Design a protein around this ligand. Structure first.
Ligand SMILES: COc1ccc2[nH]cc(CC(=O)O)c2c1
Length: 167
């Protein structure tokens, strides 16, 4: 048994809810929250800016030190950093950004990072301002992630479309 509440069960291991991932993280304090990161860990907007804003910019300060030491992530790659006030850990995962011309086939590689963690709170990768089709992102998630994933979908309209179209 875990602390996640009000999720619809899609498969053996994938759950979904219409929720603000920031508000969900603050309530649950999960072991792992996933950030929709870019390779520079520049948390300007979307899930990254909202998560970063909720940490009072401490996520961005930690991230800048990580990049100064290690250099940029790979598209499809990840790193584990602090979860600050939101979670034990933040798994920063880089899905391909369609609005920058990145290979959508890298979305499966991105979701494979989640299999290194038994339970995660996550957004859909490559959707929203990343320019991928969220229906596609949910299908890749279900067909790739084998660990227990709790998906938070911000847009109520999109949530309802994802549920009603799910195969
Ligand atoms: C605006 O920044 C982002 C970044 C990644 C995202 N993944 C999915 C969504 C849409 C949603 O949850 O409604 C989204 C939005």
């Amino acid at each position: 048994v875990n602390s996640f509440s009000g999720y619809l069960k899609l498969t053996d291991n994938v759950y979904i809810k219409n929720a603000d991932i920031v508000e969900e993280a603050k309530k649950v304090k999960p072991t792992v929250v996933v950030n929709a990161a870019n390779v520079y860990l520049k948390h300007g907007g979307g899930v990254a800016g909202a998560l970063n804003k909720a940490t009072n910019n401490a996520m961005q300060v930690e991230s800048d030190d990580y990049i100064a030491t290690n250099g940029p992530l790979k598209v499809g790659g990840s790193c584990v950093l602090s979860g600050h006030n939101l979670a034990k850990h933040c798994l920063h995962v880089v899905g391909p950004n369609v609005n920058k011309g990145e290979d959508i086939q890298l979305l499966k590689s991105a979701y494979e990072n989640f299999n290194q963690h038994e339970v995660l709170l996550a957004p859909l990768l490559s959707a929203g301002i990343f320019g991928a089709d969220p229906i596609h992102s949910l299908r890749v998630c279900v067909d790739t992630v084998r660990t227990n994933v709790y998906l938070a979908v911000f847009d109520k309209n999109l949530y309802d479309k994802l549920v009603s179209s799910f195969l």
